[PDB]
Amino acid sequence: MSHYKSNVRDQVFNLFEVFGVDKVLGADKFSDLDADTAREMLTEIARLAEGPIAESFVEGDRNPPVFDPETHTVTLPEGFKKSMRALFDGGWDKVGLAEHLGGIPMPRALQWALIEHILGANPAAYMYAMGPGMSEIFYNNGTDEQKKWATIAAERGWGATMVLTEPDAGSDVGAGRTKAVQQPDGTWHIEGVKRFITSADSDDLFENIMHLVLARPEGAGPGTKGLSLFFVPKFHFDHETGEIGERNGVFVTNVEHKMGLKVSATCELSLGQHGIPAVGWLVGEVHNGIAQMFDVIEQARMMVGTKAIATLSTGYLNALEYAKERVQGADMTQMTDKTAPRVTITHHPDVRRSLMTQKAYAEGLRAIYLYTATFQDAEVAQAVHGVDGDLAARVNDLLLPIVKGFGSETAYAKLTESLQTLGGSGFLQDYPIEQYIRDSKIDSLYAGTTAIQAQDFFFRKIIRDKGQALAYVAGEIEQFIKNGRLKTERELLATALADVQGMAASLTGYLMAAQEDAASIYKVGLGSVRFLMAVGDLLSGWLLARQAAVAIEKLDAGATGADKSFYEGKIAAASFFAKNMLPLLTSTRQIIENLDNDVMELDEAAF
């Protein structure tokens, strides 16, 4: 069929057999959504993704968007706009939207499992469809008058953008210089140039676009604390009826030529530089921009991580389907017999190693993002984990840089195995894996680079958190370890947990010693990404082992057929991951315990 190979079976296994999200379906906020309906929804969007959404995956890359300087707009290929219409006509741009905005209430864990299919089939389509979800964030942060506009925006299906980055302010958001000047009538004129804005124009997909723009009010202080957030629509509109009016002064000036994700128009966006003002409205009529915008950034980070996992998963399943059919070579037990029967390449040890590496990381990463999503609803976290609202929020905050940072790095790296499995044919555009790789490279960059994820994770989600979220997670791992068929896995998991605990202690030592020896802090920066990755590997190993424990129970109860094969695969993946990935964490701990500042003291001219 299409390039996109979905895995609803593994999602449902996670949601129901492992995490128990069906326990909240039919109760309270989710009163009107039962387990059967959730399963039917996953299967339906999976078919939508495999069908009309994936249909234009190739076309969007080979026939990419075009910037028109005559009109300061972008044109999109027709096949991709047809996919977008299939998304909208199904109501899938309102997934997890609040009920009062027209949404269907559902757990976030189910919401992200549905979105995974769009991100695997054509991820730019989800990104253009994030409008209603950003209208809800504007709603939540807006005044009572502004809530009227956000309602109109969600119901009319307007596109939306998040507008932070500038040529000199990317990782350092607080260096932004885009200015806001208050007008007599209480509106603001926004002046500046922003860069790398996703969906900054989107052809004729929508009747309006809501730009959510960070800018510095005249006279405000420096840094992120001086930034405010503004509602800047593409077109002015009647604040009561929604009728579209005159063009507002916010114009795309260029579309970037990118390695991949080409059908997502990434634009330079000029505010008030083309002869008419860019009118903006202060969100919430309060000056609190970076806090307001981080509601958007957290959702973007969850999306990027789920996108990376979705893409590895279809890369893996493409590579597996190819390997089952490709005949090449004799069995290794007959390698000296030049007349031995030829075999399919799943018989070769390096190919099985490659495939099990792909499988274990794809399924480990799916479990991580779904686990993370179970802390995103207070009700779900209470029902399935027994944790209250405050702890759930901190655990979610701890896990987000894992989903994003560890997810984005891992998926791109393991797609290398997916392509390798095809041999020379993996280098061809005829197969989708090389586009997967190119489309995935961006995941380690936007919504914050990997280094910024790792820094947030250690400084903010652990040190500032006083270790409460991390201690909670480590305690759940310890409980699994303490508890026969998984004795070896639990022993390897205990070594990996202690390794992560040693890393956290060394890094905390380097940070605390910085009070008296300032340069000590550099060793924290030197170790931070390796630490983030180690925690991801530990979490992957633990959740796979938990899945294997469930699979053992289902096999013992008499699973047969396709169920039995699925469950046997979980036991094999958990055991492979514990024996081949986890032990490397011991060497990484010892490396982190011996970090020094030599590389920091070296003259720049010696590189």
Ligand X SMILES: Cc1cc2nc3c(=O)[nH]c(=O)nc-3n(C[C@H](O)[C@H](O)[C@H](O)COP(=O)(O)OP(=O)(O)OC[C@H]3O[C@@H](n4cnc5c(N)ncnc54)[C@H](O)[C@@H]3O)c2cc1C
In the window 29-48, what residues touch a second copy (CB under 8 A)?
none
Does residue 257 touch a second copy according to CB under 8 A?
A: yes
13 DSSP assignment? I
Look at residue 391 and give the partner it binds from ligand X, a second copy, none, a contact being a CB closer than 5 to 8 Å depending on partner kind: none
Is residue 99 within 8 Å of 228, Cβ to Cβ?
A: no
Site string for a second copy, 355-384 (x = CB under 8 A): xx--x-------------------------
Angle CA 60–199–152, to nearest 5: 125
Is residue 35 within 8 Å of 228, Cβ to Cβ?
A: no
In 326-423, where does DSSP find H-type helix? 349-373, 378-385, 389-401, 407-421
Look at residue 448 and give the partner it binds from a second copy, ligand X, none, a contact being a CB closer than 5 to 8 Å depending on partner kind: ligand X
Look at residue 24 and give the partner it binds from ligand X, a second copy, none, a contact being a CB closer than 5 to 8 Å depending on partner kind: none
User: What's the token pair of residue 233?
Assistant: 């629509």
| Least distance between ligand X and beta carbon 449 (Å) | 3
In 28-141, where does DSSP find H-type helix? 35-48, 57-62, 78-89, 108-121, 123-128, 131-141
Rounded to 10 degrees, what is the CA torsion of 488, 494, 497, 499? -90
To which residue do tokens 């757990």 refer? 107
Residue closest to 176 by CA, chosen among 189, 193, 162, 159:
193
**Cβ neighbours around 562 below 10 Å, total:** 9
| Least distance between ligand X and beta carbon 319 (Å) | 9
Between β-strands 179-182 and 188-198, what pairing exists: parallel, antiparallel or unpaired?
A: antiparallel
Is residue 42 within 8 Å of 114, Cβ to Cβ?
A: yes
Task: Determine which residue in the list 244, 391, 445, 552 makes contact with a second copy, applying CB under 8 A.
Answer: 445
Q: Of the two residues 27 and 332, which places its CB atom closer to a second copy in the complex?
A: 332
Candidates 180-188, 291-299, 437-445, 542-550; binding stretch for a second copy (CB under 8 A): 437-445
Candidates 74-82, 207-215, 217-225, 228-236; binding stretch for a second copy (CB under 8 A): 217-225
State the Cα–Cα distance between residues 142 and 190, nearest whole angstrom: 18
Look at residue 198 and give the partner it binds from a second copy, ligand X, none, a contact being a CB closer than 5 to 8 Å depending on partner kind: ligand X
Look at residue 1 and give the partner it binds from a second copy, ligand X, none, a contact being a CB closer than 5 to 8 Å depending on partner kind: none
> What is the contact surface with ligand X in residues (CB under 6 A)?
161-165, 170-171, 196-198, 258, 266, 326, 328-329, 345, 348, 350-351, 420-421, 423-425, 427, 442, 445-449, 451-452
Query: Can you spell out the DSSP letters for 370-395?
Result: HHHHTTSSHHHHHHHH---HHHHHHH
Q: Of the two residues 206 and 412, which places its CB atom closer to a second copy in the complex?
A: 412
Candidates 14-22, 30-38, 74-82, 590-598; binding stretch for a second copy (CB under 8 A): 590-598
Residues of this chain, 323-352, that bind a second copy according to CB under 8 A: 324, 327-330, 332-333, 335, 338-339, 342, 346, 348-352
Does residue 427 touch a second copy according to CB under 8 A?
A: yes
Candidates 117-125, 139-147, 148-156, 435-443; binding stretch for a second copy (CB under 8 A): 435-443
Spell out the residues 6+ positions from residue 540 whose beta carbon is closer than 8 angstroms to its own.
360, 361, 364, 365, 367, 368, 577, 581
Q: Is 288 exposed, middle or buried (0-12, 13-18, 19+ CB in 10 A)?
A: middle
| Least distance between a second copy and beta carbon 574 (Å) | 11
Residues forming beta bridges with residue 190, ordered by sequence position:
180, 278
Look at residue 164 and give the partner it binds from a second copy, ligand X, none, a contact being a CB closer than 5 to 8 Å depending on partner kind: ligand X
Q: At residue 64, what are phi and psi to the nearest 5 degrees?
A: -75, 170
CA distances from 200 to 62, 204, 313 (A): 21, 12, 29
**H/E segment holding residue 305:** helix 289-325
Does residue 458 touch a second copy according to CB under 8 A?
A: no
Q: Of the two residues 296 and 384, which places its CB atom closer to ligand X in the complex?
A: 296
Cα radius of gyration (the chain): 25
**Cβ neighbours around 348 below 10 Å, total:** 17
Q: At residue 454, what are phi and psi to the nearest 5 degrees?
A: -70, -35
| Least distance between a second copy and beta carbon 403 (Å) | 19
State the Cα–Cα distance between residues 120 and 440, nearest whole angstrom: 11
Does residue 287 touch a second copy according to CB under 8 A?
A: no
Q: Of the two residues 48 and 213, which places its CB atom closer to ligand X in the complex?
A: 213
Q: Of the two residues 336 and 479, which places its CB atom closer to a second copy in the complex?
A: 336
Look at residue 228 and give the partner it binds from a second copy, ligand X, none, a contact being a CB closer than 5 to 8 Å depending on partner kind: none
Candidates 122-130, 373-381, 461-469, 515-523; binding stretch for a second copy (CB under 8 A): 515-523
Does residue 598 touch a second copy according to CB under 8 A?
A: yes
Diameter over CA atoms, the chain: 89
SS3 at position 20? coil
Does residue 444 touch a second copy according to CB under 8 A?
A: yes
Q: Of the two residues 7 and 292, which places its CB atom closer to a second copy in the complex?
A: 7
| Least distance between a second copy and beta carbon 493 (Å) | 15
CA distances from 358 to 77, 147, 412 (A): 33, 45, 11
Q: Determine the size of the site formed for a second copy (CB under 8 A).
A: 103
Is residue 549 within 8 Å of 570, Cβ to Cβ?
A: no
| Least distance between ligand X and beta carbon 506 (Å) | 19
Does residue 256 touch a second copy according to CB under 8 A?
A: yes
Q: Of the two residues 117 and 359, which places its CB atom closer to a second copy in the complex?
A: 359
Task: Determine which residue in the list 47, 82, 247, 258 makes contact with a second copy, applying CB under 8 A.
Answer: 258
Look at residue 600 and give the partner it binds from a second copy, ligand X, none, a contact being a CB closer than 5 to 8 Å depending on partner kind: a second copy
Task: Determine which residue in the list 362, 437, 497, 545 makes contact with a second copy, applying CB under 8 A.
Answer: 437
Candidates 114-122, 295-303, 467-475, 561-569; binding stretch for a second copy (CB under 8 A): 561-569
Look at residue 197 and give the partner it binds from a second copy, ligand X, none, a contact being a CB closer than 5 to 8 Å depending on partner kind: ligand X
Residue type at 507 in one-letter notation? L
